[PDB]
Amino acid sequence: VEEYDSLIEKMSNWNFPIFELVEKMGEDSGRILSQVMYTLFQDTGLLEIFKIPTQQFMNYFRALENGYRDIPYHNRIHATDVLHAVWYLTTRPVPGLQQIHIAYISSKSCSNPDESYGCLSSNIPALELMALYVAAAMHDYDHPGRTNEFLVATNAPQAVLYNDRSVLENHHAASAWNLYLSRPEYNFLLHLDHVEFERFRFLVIEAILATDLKKHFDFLAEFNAKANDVNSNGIEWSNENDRLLVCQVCIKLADINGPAKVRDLHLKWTEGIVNEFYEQGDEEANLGLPISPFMDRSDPQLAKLQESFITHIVGPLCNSYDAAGLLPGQWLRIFCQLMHHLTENHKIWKENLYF
Amino acid sequence: EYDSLIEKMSNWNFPIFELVEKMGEDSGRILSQVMYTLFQDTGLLEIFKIPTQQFMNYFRALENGYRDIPYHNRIHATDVLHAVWYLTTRPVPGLQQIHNIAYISSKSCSNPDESYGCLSSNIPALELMALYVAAAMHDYDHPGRTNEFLVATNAPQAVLYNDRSVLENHHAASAWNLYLSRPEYNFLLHLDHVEFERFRFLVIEAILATDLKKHFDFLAEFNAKANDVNSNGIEWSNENDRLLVCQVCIKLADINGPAKVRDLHLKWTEGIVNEFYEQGDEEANLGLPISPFMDRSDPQLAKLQESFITHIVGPLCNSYDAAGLLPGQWLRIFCQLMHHLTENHKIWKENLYFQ
Ligand SMILES: [C]OC1=[C]C2=C([C]=[C]1)C(O[C])=[C]C(C(=O)[N]C1=[C]C(C(=O)N([C])[C]C3=[C][C]=[C][C]=[C]3)=[C]C([B]([O])=O)=[C]1)=N2
Ligand SMILES: [C]OC1=[C]C2=C([C]=[C]1)C(O[C])=[C]C(C(=O)[N]C1=[C]C(C(=O)N([C])[C]C3=[C][C]=[C][C]=[C]3)=[C]C([B]([O])=O)=[C]1)=N2
Ligand SMILES: [Mg+2]
Ligand SMILES: [Mg+2]
Ligand SMILES: [Mg+2]
Ligand SMILES: [Mg+2]
């Protein structure tokens, strides 16, 4: 209860210094995702709204956590960071977004300054935002630190099992749900009815499956058509598919936040993913496979990787989200914190490349 | 045996149940024998230098993976394989030829003249083999339940595949898993990494197209390309246009019954309802709502047949026929299975309206 208010205050910062929390937990850093999950459901009130008994909640997420491996990047910490991002993006105030309001959540840890500000929490039903948060928690569960391309190339059992389509992302969702159903001391959704649960599950899976970057430009196209058509009105908040698509793009952005954060955090995350890349290159080399781009430890091209990734993947996504007026910011023109971070970071790396 | 069979199968209404009966004790080998026969007829054995031993090893395994169930069995698999072969080889009125990169011709007929074309002339041999192999696999290890049943009951397969195309993913996944499960099966040993990778892709795409939840999606996409009056139809040079044609081809092959002689249509109908009723029997036992048309003690057999021919089969055949891809002959044009389809559609409309 003392600890609760300490943490919720730290996480109200977009640049939540998570690695300090991992260090502060030291010995019990393995429980980071379960503690943050609890904290955020309390903050959003999702516990009271769906009458979630704490024992099972904690049972499940404690299991989920342990399903994340001890690997540089695709671990409990990443899962937690992404969960934070989606929560922040869906709760915090957005300039010029209409409010509207089947239950809906509010973050106890802030009210919309005025009526010129809206929250996604006001426009997306609580059931749907819970899916997104739970999806964030699961989205990389039991990730083996290899890419889809690697698994397909090597005809890995998983790759065969899923016919080479969204191999990891299907496995994340499948083994996560398999866990949830694997014992009754996990069924924290016991107070949702058949239809609510069916739907919840659907929404979670769609959210997880959207994190595959092979589908990146497809998702991005579909979103600009709906949201960023100049002759259309953007997002019909009343429409089921328009709401899902918003959440899909939200988690997509949450999953790759680093370049839109302070350098300190961006670089820590970078360190993690390349270390995971190099382990894969090490294995590729051993099996006599062509070493994937930017995975040859004896040739980083770290500037080229960062710039390419910001330019081709992160940049266009954030601009679509920003153009659609869905990014939390404040009035002056509008100041969008992570668009500043993204631009500052994009410039630093353009610089290291050119010179 | 060879010349006997190939002559019988040159009939669109190939009387398969006679062949199953004629094979009697060796009726379990029907799919492997027909597979062999048709690759010989098309010359696919010589073109990809396929060693018979492994070919037969694999397909004999594949056969055994088909269960002893009313409808989704080796016989259905064989029927569908026949349909795709017939549709892709036989002469099509008014279709341009192009190449008759390897292409096949059926030893068991030449285009009567230059006013006739074959699909075999317009789709590469690699791609048509995928289709045929896909037909063979397309229902492998089918448990005689619907996707909706497996999803409803949170069956392990349904969880494994996150409720998307559950059976169709399993058909392709466990089929390929078998092919790779021992080297005495590798009949494609003379394709290079790229050719094989691609072949596999094409096979899976073909199998996954047989999910009827994607029916209206596939149907839309096809009429857009093929039957647009302001577009120039099918670019036979284009990879995606050719795949889509094969997808629609197998789609149509999987549900051919209504476009066959009433004798055959009704035999197939008998099979599927017997499979339906076994599922209803189980639904009843688990205290689940019995799915439409699955309560043996209440067939509504006319309503099922009429609905299915009108809403699923009818529109598909008309799209294929409008796009001028159906084998037929000049007079106007007589399309045999359009006649069958219409006569059958009328007989069922009649049993409904009147009885
Ligand atoms: C959150 O903070 C950051 C996250 C960063 C990052 C920097 C900060 C970064 O700097 C260059 C790179 C990545 C990155 O590559 N993540 C990632 C990649 C793939 C993958 O699919 N790869 C490498 C093939 C691919 C690349 C481009 C397009 C398609 C495929 C799968 C997963 B995952 O979590 O499952 C995650 N993430
Ligand atoms: C080859 O010749 C014939 C084939 C016939 C047929 C008559 C002749 C027939 O008469 C009623 C019905 C069927 C049929 O239903 N096949 C089938 C259906 C579904 C399915 O998805 N069902 C039942 C829900 C559904 C029904 C209609 C529309 C959408 C969904 C899954 C699979 B399978 O193999 O997995 C196979 N096939
Ligand atoms: Mg991932
Ligand atoms: Mg991730
Ligand atoms: Mg099927
Ligand atoms: Mg079938």
Swiss-Prot record, chain A:
AMP binds at residues 74, 140, 255, 306. It is found in: Membrane. The active site is at 74 (proton donor). Mg(2+) 1 binds at residues 78, 139-140, 255. Residues 1-351 form the PDEase domain. Abundant in adipose tissues. Mg(2+) 2 binds at residue 140. Disulfide bonds: none annotated. Belongs to the cyclic nucleotide phosphodiesterase family. PDE3 subfamily. Homodimer. Interacts with PIK3CG; regulates PDE3B activity and thereby cAMP levels in cells. Interacts with RAPGEF3 and PIK3R6; form a signaling complex that regulates phosphatidylinositol 3-kinase gamma in angiogenesis. Interacts with ABHD15; this interaction regulates PDE3B's stability and expression and, thereby, impacts the antilipolytic action of insulin. Cyclic nucleotide phosphodiesterase with a dual-specificity for the second messengers cAMP and cGMP, which are key regulators of many important physiological process. Regulates angiogenesis by inhibiting the cAMP-dependent guanine nucleotide exchange factor RAPGEF3 and downstream phosphatidylinositol 3-kinase gamma-mediated signaling. Controls cardiac contractility by reducing cAMP concentration in cardiocytes. This is cGMP-inhibited 3',5'-cyclic phosphodiesterase 3B. The lineage of its organism: Eukaryota, Metazoa, Chordata, Craniata, Vertebrata. The gene is PDE3B.
Curated annotation (Swiss-Prot), chain B:
It is found in: Membrane. Mg(2+) 2 binds at residue 139. The active site is at residue 72. AMP binds at residues 72, 139, 254, 305. Residues 1-350 form the PDEase domain. Abundant in adipose tissues. Mg(2+) 1 binds at residues 76, 138-139, 254. It comes from the Eukaryota. Belongs to the cyclic nucleotide phosphodiesterase family. PDE3 subfamily. Cyclic nucleotide phosphodiesterase with a dual-specificity for the second messengers cAMP and cGMP, which are key regulators of many important physiological process. Regulates angiogenesis by inhibiting the cAMP-dependent guanine nucleotide exchange factor RAPGEF3 and downstream phosphatidylinositol 3-kinase gamma-mediated signaling. Controls cardiac contractility by reducing cAMP concentration in cardiocytes. Homodimer. Interacts with PIK3CG; regulates PDE3B activity and thereby cAMP levels in cells. Interacts with RAPGEF3 and PIK3R6; form a signaling complex that regulates phosphatidylinositol 3-kinase gamma in angiogenesis. Interacts with ABHD15; this interaction regulates PDE3B's stability and expression and, thereby, impacts the antilipolytic action of insulin. This is cGMP-inhibited 3',5'-cyclic phosphodiesterase 3B. It comes from Homo sapiens.
